[PDB]
Design an enzyme around this catalytic site. Structure first.
Site, mmCIF file in Angstrom:
data_model
loop_
_atom_site.group_PDB
_atom_site.id
_atom_site.type_symbol
_atom_site.label_atom_id
_atom_site.label_comp_id
_atom_site.label_asym_id
_atom_site.label_seq_id
_atom_site.Cartn_x
_atom_site.Cartn_y
_atom_site.Cartn_z
ATOM 1 N N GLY A 126 22.791 -18.104 12.077
ATOM 2 C CA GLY A 126 22.633 -19.557 11.878
ATOM 3 C C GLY A 126 20.950 -19.720 11.877
ATOM 4 O O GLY A 126 20.456 -20.584 12.407
ATOM 5 N N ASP A 138 0.691 -1.133 -0.057
ATOM 6 C CA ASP A 138 -0.019 -0.134 0.039
ATOM 7 C C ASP A 138 0.899 1.377 -0.016
ATOM 8 O O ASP A 138 0.312 2.305 -0.563
ATOM 9 C CB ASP A 138 -0.993 -0.034 1.080
ATOM 10 C CG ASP A 138 -2.178 -1.068 1.099
ATOM 11 O OD1 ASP A 138 -1.966 -1.937 0.251
ATOM 12 O OD2 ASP A 138 -2.627 -1.463 2.183
ATOM 13 N N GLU A 158 20.177 -31.953 14.265
ATOM 14 C CA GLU A 158 19.350 -31.715 15.637
ATOM 15 C C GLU A 158 19.306 -33.069 16.055
ATOM 16 O O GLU A 158 19.692 -33.281 17.341
ATOM 17 C CB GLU A 158 18.046 -31.174 15.506
ATOM 18 C CG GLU A 158 17.940 -29.441 15.502
ATOM 19 C CD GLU A 158 16.833 -28.961 15.765
ATOM 20 O OE1 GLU A 158 15.797 -29.678 16.305
ATOM 21 O OE2 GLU A 158 16.639 -27.503 15.724
ATOM 22 N N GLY A 193 14.863 -35.567 7.287
ATOM 23 C CA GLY A 193 14.590 -34.577 8.415
ATOM 24 C C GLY A 193 15.737 -33.823 8.748
ATOM 25 O O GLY A 193 16.872 -33.594 8.011
ATOM 26 N N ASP A 247 17.351 -31.253 3.234
ATOM 27 C CA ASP A 247 15.723 -31.236 3.019
ATOM 28 C C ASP A 247 14.964 -30.367 3.844
ATOM 29 O O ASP A 247 14.035 -29.738 3.317
ATOM 30 C CB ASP A 247 15.366 -32.827 3.144
ATOM 31 C CG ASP A 247 15.771 -33.542 4.278
ATOM 32 O OD1 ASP A 247 16.743 -33.147 5.145
ATOM 33 O OD2 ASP A 247 15.495 -34.681 4.440
ATOM 34 N N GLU A 297 8.818 -11.514 1.804
ATOM 35 C CA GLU A 297 9.681 -10.778 2.221
ATOM 36 C C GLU A 297 10.845 -11.098 3.152
ATOM 37 O O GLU A 297 11.968 -10.770 2.765
ATOM 38 C CB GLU A 297 8.822 -9.725 3.087
ATOM 39 C CG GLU A 297 7.995 -8.580 2.746
ATOM 40 C CD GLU A 297 6.504 -9.213 2.312
ATOM 41 O OE1 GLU A 297 6.215 -10.396 2.558
ATOM 42 O OE2 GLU A 297 5.549 -8.486 1.722
ATOM 43 N N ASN A 343 17.985 -36.660 3.994
ATOM 44 C CA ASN A 343 18.553 -37.425 5.188
ATOM 45 C C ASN A 343 17.133 -37.576 6.009
ATOM 46 O O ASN A 343 17.410 -37.964 7.358
ATOM 47 C CB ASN A 343 19.725 -37.100 5.742
ATOM 48 C CG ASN A 343 19.710 -35.687 6.243
ATOM 49 O OD1 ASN A 343 18.323 -35.018 6.392
ATOM 50 N ND2 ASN A 343 20.773 -34.908 6.483
ATOM 51 N N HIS A 350 -4.832 0.947 8.997
ATOM 52 C CA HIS A 350 -4.917 -0.327 8.187
ATOM 53 C C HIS A 350 -3.442 -0.734 8.319
ATOM 54 O O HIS A 350 -2.585 0.265 7.537
ATOM 55 C CB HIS A 350 -5.545 0.005 6.901
ATOM 56 C CG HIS A 350 -5.422 -1.400 6.161
ATOM 57 N ND1 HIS A 350 -6.096 -2.668 6.421
ATOM 58 C CD2 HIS A 350 -5.402 -1.550 4.627
ATOM 59 C CE1 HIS A 350 -6.018 -3.174 5.417
ATOM 60 N NE2 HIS A 350 -5.745 -2.788 4.262
ATOM 61 N N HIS A 351 -3.068 -2.124 8.826
ATOM 62 C CA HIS A 351 -1.827 -2.360 8.831
ATOM 63 C C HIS A 351 -1.098 -1.662 10.164
ATOM 64 O O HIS A 351 0.123 -1.256 10.154
ATOM 65 C CB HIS A 351 -0.731 -2.198 7.696
ATOM 66 C CG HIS A 351 -1.232 -2.405 6.470
ATOM 67 N ND1 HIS A 351 -1.647 -3.887 6.174
ATOM 68 C CD2 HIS A 351 -1.699 -1.695 5.153
ATOM 69 C CE1 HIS A 351 -2.043 -3.898 4.944
ATOM 70 N NE2 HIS A 351 -2.337 -2.550 4.322
HETATM 71 C C1 LIG Z 1 14.528 -20.185 11.457
HETATM 72 C C2 LIG Z 1 15.298 -21.325 12.110
HETATM 73 N N1 LIG Z 1 14.347 -22.288 12.917
HETATM 74 C C3 LIG Z 1 14.816 -23.194 13.473
HETATM 75 C C4 LIG Z 1 16.244 -23.285 13.566
HETATM 76 C C5 LIG Z 1 16.869 -24.636 14.338
HETATM 77 N N2 LIG Z 1 17.633 -25.593 13.395
HETATM 78 C C6 LIG Z 1 18.804 -25.550 13.258
HETATM 79 S S1 LIG Z 1 19.540 -26.663 12.151
HETATM 80 C C7 LIG Z 1 17.869 -27.236 11.872
HETATM 81 C C8 LIG Z 1 17.565 -28.589 11.147
HETATM 82 C C9 LIG Z 1 18.094 -28.450 9.634
HETATM 83 O O1 LIG Z 1 17.830 -29.495 9.391
HETATM 84 P P1 LIG Z 1 18.415 -29.677 7.413
HETATM 85 O O2 LIG Z 1 18.554 -28.466 6.708
HETATM 86 O O3 LIG Z 1 17.614 -30.937 6.845
HETATM 87 O O4 LIG Z 1 19.882 -30.313 7.639
HETATM 88 P P2 LIG Z 1 20.495 -31.810 8.077
HETATM 89 O O5 LIG Z 1 19.453 -32.560 8.267
HETATM 90 O O6 LIG Z 1 21.457 -31.926 6.870
HETATM 91 O O7 LIG Z 1 21.613 -31.546 9.195
HETATM 92 C C10 LIG Z 1 16.971 -26.572 12.828
HETATM 93 C C11 LIG Z 1 15.509 -26.774 13.001
HETATM 94 C C12 LIG Z 1 17.052 -22.505 13.040
HETATM 95 N N3 LIG Z 1 18.589 -22.618 13.027
HETATM 96 N N4 LIG Z 1 16.531 -21.634 12.461
HETATM 97 C C1 LIG Z 2 3.142 -9.151 3.954
HETATM 98 C C2 LIG Z 2 2.480 -8.386 2.871
HETATM 99 N N1 LIG Z 2 3.125 -7.993 1.920
HETATM 100 C C3 LIG Z 2 2.630 -7.290 0.960
HETATM 101 C C4 LIG Z 2 1.393 -6.703 1.109
HETATM 102 C C5 LIG Z 2 0.800 -5.929 0.116
HETATM 103 N N2 LIG Z 2 -0.425 -6.419 -0.760
HETATM 104 C C6 LIG Z 2 -1.447 -6.329 -0.591
HETATM 105 S S1 LIG Z 2 -2.599 -7.104 -1.630
HETATM 106 C C7 LIG Z 2 -1.415 -7.574 -2.187
HETATM 107 C C8 LIG Z 2 -1.540 -8.780 -3.719
HETATM 108 C C9 LIG Z 2 -2.314 -9.872 -3.370
HETATM 109 O O1 LIG Z 2 -2.720 -10.478 -4.972
HETATM 110 P P1 LIG Z 2 -3.376 -11.837 -4.815
HETATM 111 O O2 LIG Z 2 -3.099 -12.675 -3.605
HETATM 112 O O3 LIG Z 2 -3.007 -12.534 -6.006
HETATM 113 O O4 LIG Z 2 -5.077 -11.602 -4.721
HETATM 114 P P2 LIG Z 2 -6.134 -10.874 -5.994
HETATM 115 O O5 LIG Z 2 -6.282 -9.668 -5.343
HETATM 116 O O6 LIG Z 2 -5.259 -11.161 -7.212
HETATM 117 O O7 LIG Z 2 -7.178 -11.685 -6.050
HETATM 118 C C10 LIG Z 2 -0.253 -7.394 -2.014
HETATM 119 C C11 LIG Z 2 1.270 -7.467 -2.401
HETATM 120 C C12 LIG Z 2 0.860 -7.029 2.065
HETATM 121 N N3 LIG Z 2 -0.607 -6.872 2.622
HETATM 122 N N4 LIG Z 2 1.247 -7.813 3.259
HETATM 123 MG MG LIG Z 3 18.291 -32.980 6.616
#
Ligand SMILES: Cc1ncc(C[n+]2csc(CCOP(=O)(O)OP(=O)(O)O)c2C)c(N)n1
Ligand SMILES: Cc1ncc(C[n+]2csc(CCOP(=O)(O)OP(=O)(O)O)c2C)c(N)n1
Ligand SMILES: [Mg+2]
Ligand SMILES: [Mg+2]
Lengths: 530, 540
Positions: free
Chosen positions: A385, A27, A450, A446, A416, A50, A444, A106-107
């Site tokens: 991390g 907006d 961890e 999961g 994964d 985002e 692997n 709004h927001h």
């Molecule tokens: C945003 C976020 N949420 C949770 C964590 C905790 N975390 C660290 S490693 C991991 C799992 C990663 O698994 P994967 O990417 O499959 O790697 P691998 O199995 O090869 O170790 C999680 C949940 C984090 N680091 N960041």
């Molecule tokens: C997190 C976030 N990012 C961006 C916006 C801005 N925004 C509001 S509506 C919209 C588009 C949504 O389009 P769509 O889901 O395709 O619905 P349509 O109107 O095409 O049916 C965006 C980017 C928001 N409200 N929140």
């Molecule tokens: Mg894994």
């Protein structure tokens, strides 16, 4: 002869070769985004979300020659979705120009407090500007962009919609933003250099240790000259990996305290002198804004100039008695592929200038043991991390690589599990024909890193199995290739395949690995964590 | 006989029928997550990402009978990814128990040594906090935070250090339930409000009732239905309050949206000489019952809580109605019938879905054409409406659908959960469909409106601008890619296909997870959104 403040902003990005802009429309930023199209060479990424935009910006900044990227988000819903991206950029010193389109409701949080979101971002911003005054608006954008570059950190710019179309002299662009550092205080510098050269004189087994801040503050030429001039063994941190050309015969590997291959632990810790460059915090530490020499801090002595002046005489301050110290240095085809084999074998597949991205998990621990080529750009979010980061960053890294050189490959090792958190940004890669991009997915079943520390069989370490290789076609990749690797033979074949090495299509490779397989260094930390 | 503080936390959720916990594991919450499995009936969702977990929690809370949900995240990387989810929950008054596992009382740090930086950021979007340290008060603090969440219907931040998870506590603490009850209203203030309100109902010729979302959050839907019964006044909702009133009630006049209302609604509401507003989120003869206070014209009565006030009003409100008052006629739904082979439109879709809905449907509409469209649609008896009208974060709806579906699973297997998301919004939170497939959410319908990008944005500014484009996805491949055990997909292009889909007897039965892609013109929009678009250009 005039331009809109909106256009001015994008013109400044173009001047600093920030030619891709990440984020999403909303907006309070539509009038601003109209201006990207008025600036030759600039493209709006149009990110899938985002947080991923923020991760992309981070990846972009780590490839961009000036170490900068730009974000545009909308008030509230936009900015707060990027919070964790900007925190990580702050944590690991990445220069993000985080602009947010704000109102002249709004927001809202239901109150009438329009600064609540700006105040939250101050903790993870080097500096802010909630721009109001038309007269100082250009100067403020410039000031914020400078801080981002100089301190290599995010900056928050709140731009009210009403100030986007405000006119400004075109002539302002003729004066480049001042990016230069104040010269070091001569006496402090002289004392540092004198003392450092004195301790190099008296050292029998000195080592160089390079960390990530050496990259951010543009000391990689200086570091290479220091290795050349001293012929000292050189090592990096995991966060600093690719700071040093690992082709250099003086490169001894990656220091990780007790998690280092025992040879590295001995070579580093037996040293009677450590010349540390850009540590993130008998020792010399060059930091961005000070120098530590043992227990003494020299405030204000900036690392680049100090190193430059050190290099003019450092060779002749080397101990005359010193000899360049030596540095640290087979399965069946149908054997299942392992972590150990993969990280050894990928060394042979990399090429000059590869961007090599490793997600938190087995990948980040594994890539440490791998050998990078000349001019490799390493990305591993070791300090912050945040899993998911690597897939978002790959998007930004790939778009930056596109603007530098079509031959330059961008390679991702994600688990994964981590892939799931930020998967939709592969969409953006497909939208911009990122045919430089390799998405290696380690399946692997999961969250293996961890499982190793706590809850081996716990349901929280499970993930929903995905048909991962269907992702590129689902996102309508124009030209793509997918492979599953189960064996040593398949992996060896993939890495000698001449077509596959050419970045002419976006690729995903799924590598099937046992649930509890891990690189040696992670197996070590797991055992001592118990 | 003793339990860990970790288990205590999950036992309290079990007692409040919060039997699903959203979020992701991390370095500082693994010992805590172990405890979910010790509490019979509780499951860890294992979300695809933290923002989506937060969206899911929000969706869950809007179906949960106590209006509560629980999040567990890790220090820094976990919590900050949920920021925008908690902000929206705060914005629209949703009771989120947002717990974050934190280090013992230099990894996932801002490089400094400030361990409260993330807690301090969440204070602005939290009703109350507890950075728990003291073992002796830890149980009490969890209880206090959980109460505030319920009472103020808002998020609360609980920071739980890893070291305090396994601290032992009497099992007997669970025998004392958390006090959820409200203090009684000040009798004199209440009496004055009731006397004044009844006085103005006496003198009114054309009074209307207007119900907003806070009537839902503070459990006044029975009271609102009794007020319609007792007065026989025309009743209307806001878009944020839609489903607060049974739209089957013959006294229901539709959804009031100021100038964006169908002209009949604009006239019926704005011609009223008296507006009895219930739970507004915020002519001049207006009564507004709020959670905290009552406004009567230019006067605020502080402290007069709406539930008890309404209950006491209902005892005598009927006998304060003008004896000569005739129940006022209400807006009738004004007819729009295209041919079978005509392309499907926004106008036709939002009219026609009314015929497909059934008692108890959870009906979720994303910001975009969907949220504007569903306003014109007619909900069944006991419909649960979810539309993030105030915060308006696209992506929300798909995350919320996950939580709404898991809540529905715990109430009734027959209860369907229906999503209208745009093609654009879907992209932001797509991976939470994974979680739906992991938990066999066979109650879930994912309607995706494919209009080739951000249509609501195209209407206000930049019709052909590249920022309003999105990458086309083969969206119907999503459920199979995420390994749905039992699923069905449809593409709808025409009126004929849509009519057939809505009379299909198999499709109506919630026995598999479904996605339907509805192909629509780039610039097609519901009448009400076409109106706002045109006057948004007048304001520019
Ligand atoms: C945003 C976020 N949420 C949770 C964590 C905790 N975390 C660290 S490693 C991991 C799992 C990663 O698994 P994967 O990417 O499959 O790697 P691998 O199995 O090869 O170790 C999680 C949940 C984090 N680091 N960041
Ligand atoms: C997190 C976030 N990012 C961006 C916006 C801005 N925004 C509001 S509506 C919209 C588009 C949504 O389009 P769509 O889901 O395709 O619905 P349509 O109107 O095409 O049916 C965006 C980017 C928001 N409200 N929140
Ligand atoms: Mg894994
Ligand atoms: Mg759309």
């Amino acid at each position: 002869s005039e331009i809109t403040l909106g256009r001015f902003f994008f013109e400044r990005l173009h001047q600093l070769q920030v030619d891709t802009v990440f984020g999403l429309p909303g907006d309070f930023n539509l009038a601003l985004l109209d201006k990207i199209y008025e600036v030759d060479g600039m493209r709006w990424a149009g990110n899938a979300n985002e947080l991923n935009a923020g991760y992309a910006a981070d990846g972009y900044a780590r490839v961009n020659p000036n170490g900068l990227a730009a974000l545009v988000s909308t008030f509230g819903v936009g900015e707060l979705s990027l919070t964790n991206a900007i925190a990580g950029s702050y944590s690991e010193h990445v220069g993000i120009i985080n602009l947010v389109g704000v109102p002249s409701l709004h927001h809202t949080l239901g109150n009438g407090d329009f600064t609540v979101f700006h105040r939250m971002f101050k903790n993870i911003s080097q500096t802010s500007a909630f721009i109001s005054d038309p007269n100082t608006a250009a100067s403020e954008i410039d000031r914020c962009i400078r801080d981002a570059y100089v301190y290599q950190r995010p900056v928050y710019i709140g731009l009210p919609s009403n100030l986007v179309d405000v006119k400004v002299p075109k002539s302002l662009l003729d004066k480049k933003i001042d990016l230069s550092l104040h010269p070091n205080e001569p006496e402090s510098q002289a004392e540092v250099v004198e003392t450092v050269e004195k301790f190099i004189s008296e050292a029998s087994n000195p080592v160089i240790l390079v960390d990530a801040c050496a990259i951010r503050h543009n000391c990689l030429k200086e570091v290479a000259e220091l290795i050349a001039e001293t012929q000292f063994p050189v090592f990096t941190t995991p966060m600093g990996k690719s700071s040093v050309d690992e082709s250099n015969p003086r490169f001894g590997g990656v220091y990780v305290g007790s998690l280092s291959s025992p040879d590295v632990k001995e070579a580093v810790e037996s040293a009677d002198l450590v010349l540390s460059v850009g540590a993130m915090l008998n020792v010399v530490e060059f930091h961005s804004d000070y120098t530590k020499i043992r227990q003494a801090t020299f405030p204000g002595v900036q690392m680049k100039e100090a190193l430059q002046v050190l290099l003019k005489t450092v060779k002749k301050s080397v101990n005359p008695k010193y000899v360049p110290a030596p540095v640290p240095a087979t399965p069946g085809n149908n054997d299942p592929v392992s972590q150990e084999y993969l990280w050894r074998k990928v060394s042979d597949w990399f090429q000059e200038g590869d961007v090599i991205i490793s997600e938190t998990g087995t990948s980040a621990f594994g890539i440490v043991q791998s050998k990078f080529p000349k001019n490799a750009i390493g990305i591993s979010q070791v300090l912050w991390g945040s899993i998911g980061y690597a897939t978002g960053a790959t998007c930004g890294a790939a778009m930056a690589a596109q603007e530098i050189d079509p031959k330059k490959r961008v390679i991702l090792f994600t688990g994964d599990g981590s892939l799931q958190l930020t998967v939709q940004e592969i969409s953006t890669m497909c939208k911009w024909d990122c045919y430089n991009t390799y998405l290696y997915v380690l399946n692997n079943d999961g969250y293996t890193i961890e499982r190793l520390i706590h809850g081996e069989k716990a349901q929280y370490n499970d993930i929903q199995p995905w048909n991962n290789l269907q992702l590129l076609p689902l996102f309508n990749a124009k030209k793509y290739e997918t492979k599953r690797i189960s064996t040593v033979g398949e992996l060896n074949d993939l890495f000698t395949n001449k077509e596959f090495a050419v970045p002419d299509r976006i690729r995903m490779v799924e590598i099937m690995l046992p649930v509890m397989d891990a690189p040696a260094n992670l197996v070590a930390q797991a055992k001592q964590s118990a």
